Ligand binder design. Structure first.
Ligand SMILES: O[C@@H]1[C@@H](O)[C@H](O[C@@H]2CO[C@@H](O[C@@H]3CO[C@@H](O[C@@H]4CO[C@@H](O[C@@H]5CO[C@@H](O)[C@H](O)[C@H]5O)[C@H](O)[C@H]4O)[C@H](O)[C@H]3O)[C@H](O)[C@H]2O)OC[C@H]1O
Ligand code: CA
Ligand code: CA
Length: 167
């Protein structure tokens, strides 16, 4: 496969809680805003249930901030070509009913090219997919996943298998 993103399945990363948010996971930047007073737990988990490889990323939300992007996992770098249309696919599930996640892609200037907005995450693995086009002249973009929805308090959201593919 030819994918734009790096370590889309977390297989590069040792199992355990991630405390180095910026650099602890190859190909990703994790972020927690200061309005989140009970910070989430990001953990790379080795599990027989992983849809891809042996590992998944678990995001335990024990509270939230002011905006859903106050808890986020962003794939970076994402290597693309101007004008090209990509398919984004990822797998996600949650520990408990009722989770909400937005899957987004944008540039380093924070302009958003597209998203899946307030996706309904269930307790079973499901794929979430959309297309976007690089509408400007960027070659290195990013893919922010937003987890800080109030409905996720008391839940863990599991993601795996991010693939951003030409089309
Ligand atoms: O440390 C820094 C981080 O804080 C930083 O985080 C990034 C901040 O910028 C974020 O991008 C903004 C996200 O919000 C976008 O506006 C959205 C767009 O979507 C709107 O919802 C639409 C509703 O209707 C639907 O049909 C449609 O599908 C939806 O899109 C929603 O209402 C708006 O809030 C802004 O345009 C973005 O700029 C980015 O995600 C974060 O990663 O990152 C850098 C780091 O240094
Ligand atoms: Ca995996
Ligand atoms: Ca990083």
């Amino acid at each position: 496969m030819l994918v734009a993103n790096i370590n889309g399945g977390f297989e590069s990363t040792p199992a355990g809680v991630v405390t180095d948010l910026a650099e602890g996971v190859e190909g990703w930047d994790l972020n927690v805003g200061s309005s989140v007073t009970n910070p989430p737990v990001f953990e790379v988990l080795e599990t027989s249930d992983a849809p891809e490889g042996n590992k998944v990323l678990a995001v335990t939300v024990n509270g939230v901030g002011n905006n859903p992007f106050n808890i986020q996992a962003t794939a970076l770098p994402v290597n693309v070509r101007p004008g090209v249309t990509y398919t984004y696919t990822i797998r996600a599930r949650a520990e408990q009913d009722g989770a909400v996640v937005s899957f987004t892609v944008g540039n380093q200037s924070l302009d958003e090219y597209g998203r899946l907005h307030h996706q309904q995450i269930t307790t079973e693995w499901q794929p979430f997919t959309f297309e976007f086009t690089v509408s400007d002249q960027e070659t290195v973009i990013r893919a922010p996943i937003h987890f800080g929805y109030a409905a996720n308090v008391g839940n863990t959201i599991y993601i795996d298998g991010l693939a951003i593919v030409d089309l």
